[PDB]
Amino acid sequence: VNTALQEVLKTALIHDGLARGIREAAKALDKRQAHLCVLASNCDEPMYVKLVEALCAEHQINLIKVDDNKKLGEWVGLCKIPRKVVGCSCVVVKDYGKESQAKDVIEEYFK
RNA sequence: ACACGGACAGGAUUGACAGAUUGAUAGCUCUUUCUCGAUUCCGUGGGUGGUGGUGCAUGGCCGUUCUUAGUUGGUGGAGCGA
């Protein structure tokens, strides 16, 4: 179910909890402070970015996958609702709020 | 300053060491290539700022006629009337 991206990300932007972007993801992985990693599977061909795929096998990070760039850019960050299209490709969530329905679905996804 | 659109987390873009530059220890810019991460940059519209004009569009205030001793109603008289 997709409330593992609806109930954590929209409640996570309000708390200085997003590290959105790609080089900031590399500096956040070297901080050892990645707790939640939303990848991309949308690319020109996906073999061009292998750094966030391999630095978690050095750094023991949880990974949750998605297949989309534009619905990723509609999950997190800003947009007009002639429309301001930006697209996000990798998300490090650094911090959270206090949640009682959605701690587990980001927590227990270790398969 | 805002709004429309271009841009844009495959990064809008702020800061910056040495070296040319300069009168300069102005990342000013050019060489050079790191930091930052949607406040920000591109053209429009509209604005803002002015100890810039016109005291001959004006107020406020001040000088001067004048600190000389002048100025005006009401009822009554004069005049059709000023």
Question: A78 exposed, middle or buried (CB, 10 Å; 0-12, 13-18, 19+)?
Answer: exposed
Strand B lies under 7 A from the Cβ of residue A98: no
Closest to A88 in 3D by CA, of A76, A103, A99, A102: A76
Question: A2 exposed, middle or buried (CB, 10 Å; 0-12, 13-18, 19+)?
Answer: exposed
Strand B lies under 7 A from the Cβ of residue A56: no
Q: Cα dist. A19→A15, A72, A93, A94 in Å?
A: 12, 14, 6, 7
CA angle, residues A36, A86, A97, in degrees to nearest 5:
30
Structure determined by = cryo-EM
Which residues 6+ apart lie within 8 Å of A67 measured at CB?
A: A41, A42
* Bridging pattern class, strands A36-38 and A91-93: antiparallel
Contact indicator for A93, A24 with CB cutoff of 8 Å: no
- CA of A77: nearest nucleotide by C1' is B9
Q: Give rounded-to-5 percent helix, strand, coil for chain A.
A: 35, 5, 55
Provide the strand spans (E) within chain A.
36-38, 91-93
CA angle, residues A89, A67, A56, in degrees to nearest 5:
60
Q: What is the identity of the amino acid at A109?
A: Y
Q: How far is the CA of A27 from the C1' of B34 (A)?
A: 14
